Amino acid sequence: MSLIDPRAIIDPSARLAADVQVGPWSIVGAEVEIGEGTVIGPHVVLKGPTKIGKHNRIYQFSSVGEDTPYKGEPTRLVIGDHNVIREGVTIHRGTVQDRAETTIGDHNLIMAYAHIGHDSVIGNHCILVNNTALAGHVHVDDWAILSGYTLVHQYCRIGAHSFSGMGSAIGKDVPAYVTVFGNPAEARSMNFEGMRRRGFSSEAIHALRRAYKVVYRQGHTVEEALAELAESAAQFPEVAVFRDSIQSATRGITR
Amino acid sequence: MSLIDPRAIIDPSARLAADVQVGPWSIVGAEVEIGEGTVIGPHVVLKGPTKIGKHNRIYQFSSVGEDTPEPTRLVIGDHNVIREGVTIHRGTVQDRAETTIGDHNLIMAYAHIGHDSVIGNHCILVNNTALAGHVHVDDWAILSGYTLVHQYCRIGAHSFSGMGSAIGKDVPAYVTVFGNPAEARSMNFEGMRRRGFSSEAIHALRRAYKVVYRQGHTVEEALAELAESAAQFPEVAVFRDSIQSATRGITR
Amino acid sequence: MSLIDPRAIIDPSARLAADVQVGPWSIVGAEVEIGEGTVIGPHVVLKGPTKIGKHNRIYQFSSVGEDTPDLGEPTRLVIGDHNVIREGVTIHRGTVQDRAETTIGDHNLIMAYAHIGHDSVIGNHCILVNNTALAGHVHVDDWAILSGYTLVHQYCRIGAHSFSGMGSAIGKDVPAYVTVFGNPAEARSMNFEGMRRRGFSSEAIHALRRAYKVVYRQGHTVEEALAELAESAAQFPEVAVFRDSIQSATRGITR
Ligand SMILES: Cc1nnc(CN(Cc2ccc(C#N)cc2)C(=O)CSc2ccccc2Cl)o1
Ligand SMILES: Cc1nnc(CN(Cc2ccc(C#N)cc2)C(=O)CSc2ccccc2Cl)o1
Ligand SMILES: Cc1nnc(CN(Cc2ccc(C#N)cc2)C(=O)CSc2ccccc2Cl)o1
Structure with a gap:
């Protein structure tokens, strides 16, 4: 069986490393770039301009690189290496001109149905648990953990090694190492x-x-x-x- | 490249206007009518009896026209955007409680429109907004991300709910509501x-x-x-x- | 017509009863077992070792039998009879070694985008309403009703005939028959x-x-x-x- 399943759709403008795997009924759209050792599962929609690095895993029913809900303004999504993007995750592209593209670093785990809004920046070793939603322009520093159903207001900064409890609704910045809980979020320890x-x-x-x-x-x-x-x-x-x-x-x- | 992708399944009883686009691996079930300029993305499930109007856009992984978990109907107007993973159930015809969506609505990723719900025009239902059932949403209402609406609730024209709001009572027109349980603010x-x-x-x-x-x-x-x-x-x-x-x- | 759609993928190690229906573009993975009268919708991902009983219904865009996003440990998922699994539901396998397989009994209704974490145990006649999330090691006893968007902390027990209100965040055990509301959940009646x-x-x-x-x-x-x-x-x-x-x-x- 071929690395690119014959039931998948690869756009002629897409650039793929030789060992990339693409599962059946998946779409690798125009201007999508995928690095070495990345595994695209079945039923995945990838839209560009998007850069996906090395050794990534993207699961079924995810929509990675969608437009946010002037004509021809360059928008981009950059994903680093060793990331896991689980089922149904939605990731929107971000504007290039203002250096506000959507960026995801390395070794991140983005769990089922999480949402990464336009112009968000995720560092390294982060965990976004099921249905976490970053409204847009959110900056998530290294090692931050956002528990299931954590909602993040636009323009919020989540500090390095910080933690949110399940169902938290963050409206203000979370300092590094701080644990937050509730709707609205409150600092605990x-x-x-x-x-x-x-x-x-x-x-x-x-x-x-x-x-x-x-x-x-x-x-x-x-x-x-x-x-x-x-x-x-x-x-x-x-x-x-x-x-x-x-x-x-x-x-x-x-x- | 045909407007109706050859990998989609189109039931013979479905009625599509000449310029309708349907992406690959989509299902357009029996008794599903689709008007001019509508674009159906890939991996979409459309079930009827459902009438979809003109110039709509329905994104991947949506289930539109589902039975509730007697003739039942779902009517969607014109110029609506239904994003990824949205679920829309039909409503009962005999009691005039069919599920209705008007025009120029934006229904964002994974929002849920329960049976017998009525949405007006120019409404915005942000990601994961959930209408339990028999919910009436009047014109220009904005329901922020993860807003939950109890069955039979009415959401007034130009009203607004904050993110993660849980609405159990009627929201008057123009009113801003926040929290779980929802409280009026301004x-x-x-x-x-x-x-x-x-x-x-x-x-x-x-x-x-x-x-x-x-x-x-x-x-x-x-x-x-x-x-x-x-x-x-x-x-x-x-x-x-x-x-x-x-x-x-x-x-x- | 054909009970197994020719567009579905059936792994040669999967074991199915003769009248099992499988919709187009569905994957029936290795080590998946499916009983009499079960209907698998289109766009379904089934992964094993998993046993699915009789007269079940699994809807489109569901991922049933996946492994948790954090662990050669053999793990399993067992589903009983007459269950309904709605669209986009995610159900993870358990662990056999410590007797913590993920198990679901009979006559359950698991509604759209509900999440069943690893090692969870659901009894009979339960209803998990849309986007209810069981973090993992959660025990749900008979006839419990968890309203839309109920979040359940790891190791929590949900008593028989109990009820949670919409958007409840459960961090402690819910006694049998108890009604609970809010984030954090509070007993009402x-x-x-x-x-x-x-x-x-x-x-x-x-x-x-x-x-x-x-x-x-x-x-x-x-x-x-x-x-x-x-x-x-x-x-x-x-x-x-x-x-x-x-x-x-x-x-x-x-x-
Ligand atoms: C499982 C489990 N292991 N730890 C926890 C606690 N946790 C933070 C957390 C979760 C996972 C990792 C990892 N890799 C690290 C931390 C939550 O988000 C609970 S809520 C939740 C959890 C899962 C699904 C839906 C929901 Cl709602 O859950
Ligand atoms: C982006 C953005 N632009 N405005 C906001 C604030 N907003 C209202 C709102 C949102 C979108 C439109 C539009 N078209 C209009 C109003 C929220 O719903 C915040 S929460 C949230 C936001 C986005 C995803 C998930 C979540 Cl959970 O977000
Ligand atoms: C519809 C309806 N019928 N009863 C209710 C109340 N209910 C419990 C409940 C729900 C369904 C069954 C059943 N079969 C039994 C009890 C909720 O969870 C409301 S919240 C909600 C409800 C639906 C979608 C999203 C959300 Cl958020 O809703």
Whole structure:
């Protein structure tokens, strides 16, 4: 049996690496580029201009590279390497001219029926659990986990190693390591489980626990908090990752 | 390349207008009528008795015209966009509760339109919005992502629900609702300005909101107080009529 | 015509009863077993080791028998008789080694886009309404009704004849007959409506109303409540079902 199933439709403008697998009844549309070792399942719709990197797995009933719901404006979707895109996932392209294309990095897991809205940016090692929805212009940093049915408002930033509880509705920025829950989302604590899994030192975990309290439990303003964290951020690069996510928040921080 | 892809299944009783496009591996079932300029994507399941109007677009993995889990019908108007994975059930004809969708609607990815529901014109049902059944959505309503609507609920003209809202009661026209359970917050003044409502009409609607929600009046007292402004501004009469026709009470 | 559509793919290791119907563009994977009177719709993906019983109906765009997006461990899915699996439903296999296969009994209705996580167990006469998600290791007892978009945390037990309202987020065990609402889920009352439809005696309904008060409205600890329910449970099999569900609660009960 051929690597490209004879029941699949490959557009003559699509560029594929030699070992790409494409399952039956799948469409690889115009201007779709697919890298080495990628596996396209059956019943998949791929639309371009889209770049899919190496060693990716895209499951049935997914629509990857769709137009968002002027004529001829260049729009693009870039997906890196070692990603898993499960059944029914929808991923929209993003505008090129303004450097706001839809981008997905490496080693991500995008679970069933998740939605990635136009101009969203997903880093590396993220997990978007079933039916997570990024409205659009969402920035998800490395190792973030969004539990099932997490809804993210347009323009929100989800910090590195952050966590959302199931059914959370995020309206403001989530700082690095922070855990959020409910509709509307509220900050609860820090992802100490994720910190341990990543092999963080005891001094680094303690400095981060102290950092959370400075921001959320000591009644200080964002301006007051950032000034107090300066000393701790200089000694630990992980407290600096927390400090930078607060400093770069536009919609305010999830409290 | 033919308009009707040779890999699609078209039942002999289906009636398609000459320029209708059907993508590969789509099923156009028996008693399905499709009007001029409509585009059916690939992997679409269309079941009848269903009448689809002119210049519609139906995306992949949609199931339109499903039986509810006696002649039943589904009627879809003109210029609608039905995105990927949307599910639309038919409604009962004898009791005049067929499922109806008007014109210029945008029904986004994985939205669900339960049996006997009625959607007006220019409505937006964002991703995963779910109408349980017998839901009436009036013109220009916006239901944000993952809005859930209890059976028999009425969604007023130009109303708005925030993301993840769970609506159990009627939403009056223009009203903005948020959360689970849904709570009224304000009016959609932004929408009024886009529609070209006058400053005077907006002013009267803002006063009408206060009468219903911020002055401790009963529904009976509020309706009597709005009578004067409703005769003067047709937009206020839209707001008053939606409260008058509320069978499950109003969202507060 | 032909019971198996010529456009369907039937793996040579699949075992089917002679009258099994399979629609166009459906995949019946390796190690899939399908019983008498079952109808598989078009665009269905079935993956094994999976057993599907008699007189079942599986709708378009469903992925039944897939492996979880995180694990040579042999895993299985077993589905009983007279079930209806609506469009876009995802059902994952379990694990055999620790006796946690994913199992679904008889006369169940699994509505559009519902998710059945790995190692979950569904009894009989249950209804999972549109987009209900069982994260994994979830036990759903007989006649439970989970309203649209109900989210169920891993390891939660849903009691017999219980009911969740639309958009409920369940993080603790739901006792038998209990009605729960919101995110986080909160106990409200009992499903008396369901009892009456099931033909429960007025005496059994009266005893269950009293049982709810003992657990939830009289300031008793779970130890105290279980001691007070002992007498009623010995007399009413329906009260024993309620008592057993509180006894077997590992995550505490939904209050
Ligand atoms: C299974 C399981 N393992 N951990 C959890 C908790 N979790 C976060 C999480 C989930 C998966 C990975 C992984 N790889 C990591 C973290 C949730 O999102 C629960 S909700 C949910 C879960 C699954 C489907 C639908 C829903 Cl709604 O679930
Ligand atoms: C994109 C975008 N543009 N506006 C918004 C806000 N919006 C209303 C809205 C959304 C789209 C149109 C349109 N055509 C109009 C209004 C939401 O529904 C947010 S939630 C959400 C949003 C998108 C996907 C999934 C989810 Cl869950 O999102
Ligand atoms: C229709 C209808 N008939 N009863 C209800 C109430 N119901 C429970 C329920 C639903 C169906 C059966 C059945 N067979 C039994 C109980 C809900 O879940 C409402 S929410 C919902 C409902 C439908 C789609 C999306 C959503 Cl979100 O809806």
